[PDB]
Amino acid sequence: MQHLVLIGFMGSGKSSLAQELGLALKLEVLDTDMIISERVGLSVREIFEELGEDNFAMFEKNLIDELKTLKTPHVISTGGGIVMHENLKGLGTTFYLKMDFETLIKRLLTQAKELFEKRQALYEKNASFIIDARGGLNNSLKQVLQFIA
């Protein structure tokens, strides 16, 4: 609960922001996309295609509990599977990196819009803080650094 937890959709650019936020604050950064792929042995993309998003999200939800094992404060990029998460706020201060749907869509249909709407509601229910992604990585970073001050 002094972990800084970047949460948001996959493709939102949280991993890269995490990297740069760690560097700025002299903190280690952990990316649950990385851990899950490292431990499962398959790429994010293969897990998504062969096992589905619900199972990615399960992988993530099980890693969260382990992440409270951490003796030091970390930047943690996670939340690609918010559907399965109950309250990652118990992991630390969570920042939702909020991107509009059309912009998320470019970086990666009525059914996708439906999903996006439902999951955004979960992200902001799980967020201690909201960072507006529209302005790009450094403007998101400034936002996070301003919350910290």
Author numbering: 1 to 108, 122 to 162
Task: Give sentences copied directly from the paper behind this entry.
SK catalyzes the specific phosphorylation of the 3-hydroxyl group of shikimic acid, using ATP as a co-substrate. The shikimate pathway is comprised of seven enzymatic components that convert erythrose 4-phosphate and phosphoenolpyruvate into chorismate, for subsequent synthesis of aromatic compounds.
Instead, E53 from the SB domain forms hydrogen bonds to the guanidino group from R132 (E53 [Oε1]-R132 [Nη1]: 2.21 Å; E53 [Oε2]-R132 [Nη2]: 3.58 Å) located at α6 (CORE). The R57A mutant structure shows a notable shift of the SB domain owing to the interactions between E53 and R132, rather than those between E53 and R57 in the wild-type structure, revealing a crucial role for R57 and R132 in defining the best active-site geometry to accommodate promising substrates.
